[PDB]
């Protein structure tokens, strides 16, 4: 049985205890159970070793995975609730040396959407954000966490452009982000309504603006891109953490390249870094070669200086004052179009867009790192 | 067919007697079934060559392997259970011209892992070790050959930091030691599940702590950097000639060196030397040129002594009881963050580190030899 | 039967006269039977075409193949013996327009394996090879085109460590050098047991030694080397004419140069220049042009007791008796490991290597010939 | 279906006349059965158009093709070696205004094997031919016409290297190009023994020398090349007309470029361009732009005149004095091996050899044109 009582109580308590995730953890004689309370995976409970495989089936059922299988890694998405307990969860299981692990990340439950300007965009990208959002066509991707970051911010563009004067529609399995002005297609793969098939249908639904809640597979990426091809703004949750990465990804997904070429217009990021404790910030020399190699706009290479917190009344034993959303706007002009199709790297696409002082997850990130807002280290982790 | 117990027992004994693995090894007429105790493949039992196949058929039974496919090796973690074992076995069966063969690596458990100091560090070298693993986030690199003790460190550090407050996950193609506080897994890069793909799995699985058994592709350093600095803490392992070289190599491997310039907290390099058995140690004098090259004074050279692991039953006939490593430790600061991004050579980085008080891998080796812990011959033979 | 005797007698003499193999094949009027005595297929006897099928049926019986299926290709193995003869035979057959062809190569046993110091070494080569066998872990890059002595070399290095107390695991197809106490594997790519799959198992066999008769492909190269990197000894076959080129190939076969700079012990580039038969040893000073092609110095020319392989009888008229592993030894020292980690080419490695004493195949083979071992015609055909 | 009566009157005459082809022509009321002889047709027999269709099925039958499908084109070939009938028939059908043309192309009698020097290669080619065979391993690939190029010349290579002391075998269907000292295989695709299968034995038998009469399977291309990887001298026929083409084609066959690149040591070609009278020569401009576009040595681009006959009692009647053997040797070095993987063009891969004085068909040809023996037009006719 339990097994199941751990999934259920770990979930209830994960939410009730202010955790960021749920774990039932395959172990040597047992299965450890942990909750990410205040960011830390504190012990919760224990199951006997085989109970582990029981808990991975439970979570697979919840989000469209192969329930029966007890040996292979899988992931999908769960909308879970129980009374006071109500969270969008990231579903994933993983075979371990003691059977598969059962994990449910707690994603921000819908929580609506932030705007682009709300991010506090550096003028390097903000003035250009206005440029890009004024152009309601092509694929316009968003980076970061499931729900939480990406699907949370994916519709950020839409909040700026899905105005009374534009047709917006989104495909989700099931719908979480009930956002204006969007038609939120509810994906039901068991009947053939995959995001992919729904996207082809989005064209049938005459989009000005097209959305994907999560581009989770090749048929979906292929079709999302087809959906952009006829001149519509395919805004989408791209399973990435870097704007330039979001751009190249369609090739990686096996998207038929004729669609890729006709589709991409730009990418939005706000990926978070640990924010340096500004008030006890430790001078750290950035390495300007680190910054150069990163491809930053010279002043932001040379006059740049790092900090790290030493620990503080404003960061605790982390060295960082909570978090900082790093800004980015990539813009796909004709030369970038060629770069995408050619399979150019995130560094190359970002480095190009970055010039003229344009902020990227790397340039804004590192730029702020270099003021003492974050640490170049963290930024680099954001933009690897 | 006594073979069923036979398989389970060679396995049982390999684990019981502290082997790293099990070998049901064929011969022209019989089978040399062995246990790798202290590194020696001790003869558990022979089998008639005909019984070889009965025995290998059994390892395929126990492992759920395609027992009918005599033309192929088959492999996986086998839940063999008898006496000493609840060790999982990396069963690998294989056809031979004598019939078939099978090997079972002992997937030691959490409870079997060594400490981070047990690795054999000099106090100041260890101080650096400790500082690096003690951070709440960031990455600790380990480097050297399998048999470098890299495993001891790899498993040990997580034993040390994989507490009940940090979900830990580990990426180990051979598994070897199934760490505490951890949801450790298999890799098999042939399947697409490379060591980097496994890091991505860990992140999907919300680890607070992530570890890489082998950096192969650049993603095993780059994702490791991500996790290390996306709020998680990371341990990761390479195969180099020094600590300094870990940095050199990651740049060379395609880790755009602003990665690691970023997460790298520090680097450990090591090599195991066989550890002289107390029932084998023989006093011999080490060579003055080597000793001098490794920093020993003339007065010390004349008083210098090595101990040779001559051989006894208490050490599996290897002459050495257990293993001990040669060490080098680097802590990352601004001098190093530059060197990392700059793509500096192992020599260039090592010299910076020596300025900072780091003993080199080879110098430290000598000093272990001089205590009779190992033999200088063994040190040199291992670096 | 005559067929049994045709097979018995050719094998009988194949062993006794030192053939590396037996070749029975149809020609336009008969079937020629040849022995690779001292490196070339001297004529042994012939048999009358219908006899091909009778004789070949017998060799198929020996190797376990389908007796007379002269319409489709096959392979297998036999444990052959007569007394004083004991050799396994390598069997494969080919349907031809004249009936079906076969080859029975002689599968040399452990008793036929040289020592390490015998692997083409000059006094200075062993001193340096001492340093090679003394390296902590890694791979021995034995290299050259088919027809060379690579299988002896792989076994010589292996034999040193090929014991009942070591996990000696070899790839042969079928097994030749049976050493009781070690595991010797026949690959089966038809089943899926490619050399690489076998090696994957070998790595999974927790080998002390991965000895590979043929680096068939990239995975085969890597996996054997993965053991080399992961604390084991690896002994294997490459196809180059420079030791520097062997390394270049190891790097170019997909074996990571960064890992190779750790995993590589040494390179044994060698070619079996055929040795001039003692009974045909006619002083020749080759063309004379080959004398200059191989680089002889005046001193070496004056001492050039170069002989022509006229054959006479010792290998029939094929020219030579005994073979010599011309040996270009590259000790993979820290400067070579550096050249490797740096991604250096065969030229660049060769320049460092020769600077460090890596006498080339051209120079060494040449010297062997000067010493009365071989003919420079063979050295030229055995170098680059 | 007789139909066949008219066709058979023709296979009799067509084979007797050394015709290039047998033409069952889909005409308006009837079917012509024509003979292409000495480069051009003459008619011989006539079927009704109803019989056209009968023959379309007949030739599809001979190749094991879909004989019911009288509307769509199909091909293959058959061993028509019935005494007086001694030429393979190339099976092809092709739909026209009155049904498919049914074709029985005469895959010209081997005309056996030249002793390669016999080709009359320019000295900078022949002496290099000799240089290539001095290193007897890997692939020595040859192109050119059936009966005057394909296996004609690859077997010429065997004739010059595959002595009785080498384990040498070929794959043909049927065997025609015969060499004493060598095994020659009949492929039996009917049994399932395709050229790939024939090669599987060639690889498995560990020969000194391997010959493929026609690289006619994915697996054939692959296996021949896999054998070459280990140093077997895989001489092979690639049924095309240019060495430069032959250098990269196996990749098209699905053959791993690792094995293709590692394998090659040289590739030849030959042509029959028509000669001119010389005595009654017509000056034709050796246009240097033609020659430059061709990539010829300046020795030929500028150092030249072409000569055409007048058609002309010393030619004829096309203005040319019979067939003129033109040759090529693309010697393969390390840079060429890099080019194989790259997939360099025929002009480029050919140009490299040409600039070394190694006259290619394009140079040896055009050279012979530019020397006034033939015209650039006839050579270009073949050096396309």
Curated annotation (Swiss-Prot), chain B:
Gene Ontology cellular component annotations, sorted alphabetically: cytoplasm; plasma membrane
Keywords: ATP-binding, Cytoplasm, Metal-binding, Nucleotide-binding, Zinc
Broad class of the protein's primary localization: cytoplasm
Record has Nucleotide-binding as a keyword: yes
Residues the entry annotates as binding Zn(2+): 277, 280, 312, 315
Keyword Transport part of the UniProt annotation: no
Coiled-coil residue spans: none
Cellular compartment(s): Cytoplasm
MF GO annotations: ATP binding; ATP hydrolysis activity; metal ion binding
Binding site residues for ATP: 147-152
Family, similarity comment: Belongs to the GSP E family.
Role played: ATPase component of the type IV pilus (T4P) that plays a role in surface and host cell adhesion, colonization, biofilm maturation, virulence, and twitching, a form of surface-associated motility facilitated by cycles of extension, adhesion, and retraction of T4P fibers. Acts as a molecular motor to provide the energy that is required for biogenesis of the pilus and the extrusion of substrates generated in the cytoplasm. PilB ATPase activity is also essential for T4P extension while antagonist PilT ATPase activity is required for T4P retraction.
Domain notes: The ATP-binding site is essential for assembly of pili.
Subunit annotation: Homohexamer. Interacts with PilC.
Name listed for the protein in its UniProt record: Type IV pilus assembly ATPase PilB
Species whose genome carries this gene: Thermus thermophilus (strain ATCC 27634 / DSM 579 / HB8)
Shown part of the complete sequence: 505 to 887 of 889
